Amino acid sequence: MQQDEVIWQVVGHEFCSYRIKGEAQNFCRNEYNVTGLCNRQSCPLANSRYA
Amino acid sequence: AAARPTVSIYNKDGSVSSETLALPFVFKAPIRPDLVRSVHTAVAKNKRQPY
Amino acid sequence: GRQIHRCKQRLTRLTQYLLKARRLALKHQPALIPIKPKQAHREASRERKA
Amino acid sequence: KYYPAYRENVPKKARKAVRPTKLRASLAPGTVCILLAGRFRGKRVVVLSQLEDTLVVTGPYKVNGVPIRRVNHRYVIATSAPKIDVSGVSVEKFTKAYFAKQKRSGPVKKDEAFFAENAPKNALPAERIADQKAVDAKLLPAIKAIPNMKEYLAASFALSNGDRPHLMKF
Amino acid sequence: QRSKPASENVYLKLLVKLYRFLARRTDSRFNKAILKRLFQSKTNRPPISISKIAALTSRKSASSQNKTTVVVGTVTDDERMLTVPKLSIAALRFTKSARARILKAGGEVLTLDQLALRAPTGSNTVLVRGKKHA
Amino acid sequence: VNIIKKRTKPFKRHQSDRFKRVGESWRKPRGIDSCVRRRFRGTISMPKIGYGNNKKTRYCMPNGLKAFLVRNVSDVELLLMHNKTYAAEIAGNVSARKRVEIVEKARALGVKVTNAGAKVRSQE
RNA sequence: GUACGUGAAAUUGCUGAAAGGGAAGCAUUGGAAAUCAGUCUUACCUGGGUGAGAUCAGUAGUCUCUCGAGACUAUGCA
RNA sequence: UUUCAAUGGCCCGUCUUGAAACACGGACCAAGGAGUCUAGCAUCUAUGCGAGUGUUUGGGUGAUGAAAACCCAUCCGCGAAGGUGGGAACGCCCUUGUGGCGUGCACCAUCGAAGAGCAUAGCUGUUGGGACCCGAAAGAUGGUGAACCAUCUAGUAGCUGGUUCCUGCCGAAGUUUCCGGAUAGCAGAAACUCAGAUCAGUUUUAUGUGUAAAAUGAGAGUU
RNA sequence: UUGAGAAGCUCAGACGAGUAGGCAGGCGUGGAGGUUUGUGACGAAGCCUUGGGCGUGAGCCUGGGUCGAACAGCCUCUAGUGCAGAUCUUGGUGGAAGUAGC
RNA sequence: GCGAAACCACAGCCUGGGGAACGGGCCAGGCAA
RNA sequence: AAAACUUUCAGCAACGGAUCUCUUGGCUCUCGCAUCGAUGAAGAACGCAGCGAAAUGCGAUACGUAAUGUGAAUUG
Secondary structure, three states, X not given: OOOHHHHHHHHOXXXXXXXXXXXXXEEEOOOOOOXXXXXXOOOOOXXXXXX | OOOOOEEEEEOXXXXXXXXXXXXXXXXXXXXXHHHHHHHHHHHOOOOOOOO | OHXXXXXXXXHHHHHHHHHXXXXXXXXXXXXXXXXXXXXXXXXXXXXXXX | OOOOOOOOOOOOOOOOOOOOOOOOHHHOOOOEEEEOOOOOOOOEEEEEEEOOOEEEEEOOOOOXXXXXXXXXXXXXXXXXXXXXXXXXXXXXXOOOOOOOOOOOOOOOOOOOOHHHOOOOOOOOOHHHHHHHHHHXXXXXXXXXXXXXXXXXXXXXXXXXXXXXXXXXXX | XXXXXXXXXXXXXXXXXXXXXXXXXXXXXXXXXXXXXXXXXXOOOOOOOHHHHHHHHOOOOOOOOOOEEEEEEEEOOOOOOOOOOOOEEEEEEEOHHHHHHHHXXXXXXXXXXXXXXXXXXXXXXXXXXXXXXX | OOOOOOOOOOOOOOXXXXXXXXXXXXXXXXXOOOOOOOOOOOOOOOOOHHHOOOOXXXXXXXXXXXXXXXXXXXXXXXXXXXXXXXXXXXXXXOOHHHHHHHHHHHHHHOOEEOOOOOOEEEEO
């Protein structure tokens, strides 16, 4: 019910409502992003422990 | 697959209740974004009208 | 160390935001009064007739 | 706000260390030279002493009026004129700081900038002239002894028709 | 050539992700072989029957001991044989009829992830394949 | 890593100057006997992968920033931590009302706005 | 302004510009004229004084959470 | 951006032709405009189940579109009807490495005599259907005053003209051979087994120009 | 050392003609379910323009002028989806030409 | 005064050679107002 | 070499009616129902309005009457 791997394989690749498709990089609209980009280390939804 | 045995029932007033339900076995089944897509893809063409 | 690294950067980058918000408020920066396409046209036509 | 906000890749240790410059043999101090570029191009100037890159040089104020100035060795033609003793003048006081351009300093209150009522003048300080007058007092006596040298510095370098700089050594 | 599965079973792209690390960070050929076969098409991965597995471990001199049979692909049962022997099996998929038959009388069934945490180097595992001709 | 381009001029279509029914959008000439397709002298060039720019410089404005299109004021906030590499391009249909909200917010955030003076007017 | 929403291209007339020995045409390299790109010392650090505030009180209360973590209300500004 | 200066560059598409020569088609601009829809077959891949498989003929049901979704009764379709060595992988070692001892999958050799489908979706291919688009006198039926009209008709084509965005990789053959073809070959695409193995529009050595056995290189061979 | 969109990041070397043809990744149009708590009378779509940019390119973003009511980015679904030709269909418009001439 | 249709890739000095016509474009030439 | 003429580019005005937005229309599928005429149908012609250009409506009881309603408008 709580897996960083399956959650990422959906949000990271199928569809996440916060991703902005840039020209070089993807940006994340999620308010809890420490970087503002769409990454695997950055994304607030996949990472189960976050700050 | 180990996750969250019990769920809590909320009354009308919004306060939690002491009763609880074991998380159903369905709530651990595989999560497949590709298989849901290629089934929703099909099942959504079933209320179509011909032109 | 990656996770603590990114939080410190954000704290650094948020403080610079708060600083810049303060200094801009101090300075008497100009307002930005926008431009309307209907009033601009109507005044352009009414003038020519005048 | 000191913890580096971004990745900010730092410059790798560059393996370049500054070494002393090597000047031309004829650029030894006390050599008449043909200034090439600058507002005082074409005059003839003796070399007081060398510097890091340039040559601290001055022409006789009482003859040519060339002040002590850094002139890059590349913009100087090394003339084979008979060398002039320059050992007398104190060349040690001539440094980069002495020839440094005045720092962009002297802030003004934000009312005098308007109406243009704060303009100073950087007019040459007397000790700068007094430094040169001492240099003249130590080089003007030197130069008159060599015949025609005083007039030679007075004259202005130029090329006539059919002048080949390579053929006629300066 | 083949270095990315054509599949879109998201969990097979997690199984490969585990055996891409194992293959390149261990010196065993079991991992390099397992990873290759996780890339193969559905046609190239034949079903391997329970009876065929039962014959292979209990073959010739028998002496099955407690070796674990590993196959990338399904393990369909064989109702044509009544007494199934004790078996430890790892596979991508089982059939509910087969998995019950292994569980009811004998050992246990495993997925490729439970084998890896037990024998990451392929320690004492039989790697079988089904009949390709079909 | 400075912003250097392998070519400035655009690739125009062959014979696109002569005709007006022929658009200037680059179309590959597939003519069998086409000498201009055959790379003769005095002809025009043709897009090749050899013309790509530095991968650390692709999409980069001449001042080094990569344009980033911000629709509303929410978008200008996420450029908080990439203000040194991205520049907040304001969408063309964003009204003059929210256009000031975007520019004033971006000024304090520290990010660079590319079209900060459109449809608006200053007042002292 | 009823030849009436937007009013594209072809096409034609007027004006301004440069050019104009049987073509034109485009491509490179510039020049010239004409015109736009974008400008920014300013902030940082340090020193003191002056009044402050609070996430600080050898301090007092309430609210939601989970002792202390928040949002505040007094009170003093060490 | 216009213009000039110096260097340059034979009109595009089709077809023809090695190539051109050509002969065509092109007064200009806008819009419209041509591998599509479907049944059958085979292939590759993806998914669900797996000795099974397939709810949608139909019935049950669905209060918020109820032509959806959800559920399953009786059939039915398609399936179902042993040794030897080489071998993948593994263990035991043990002079370790080297290798041996083994256990030996898929499969291949040998001696011989422990089922893998079904259904859906896609891709490419093929056969029909108006069948990529346009173009050959028709003919027939039935009417109107030899003529003319309307439909059957999407009648017929090996032929003619046309068949629409970008980049990247690989890239022939252009012809043997038998005989309109089946071969082959070239190019691929997959599956295999090996570099401690074989090779070469190769060259030597030498035996009688061929053949056989050294160098120079390249991993080579299959289905 | 932060460089886990492991579909990422990084390192090294060689290489780059191309028809028939084979393979792959993309750009664009109409509409469809999801989404951007998206844009819009403080001006949507469109249009022109020697404004500025982005991409090898298909294409894209933006400034100004007109304009006046709608529209779009992203993930998938889908098809009457991309033109320079077809003596192509339709409409428009020239030279020929103030000519043949009446 | 009233006013077409045909036609139209675009043009239009030749001299020669330019191998496949090449002259209607290419190079040597003159001409070129 | 300027004008004239020829040429390109820009401004402006014509010309043309694309594009964009919609839309009391088309097409497609499903659904319910059973109803013409010798008691003169379908069709046609001629008429008819305080005035109609088409267009509908109507039949010398003519852009309709009776009756049941609604309840104050027709509208150039």
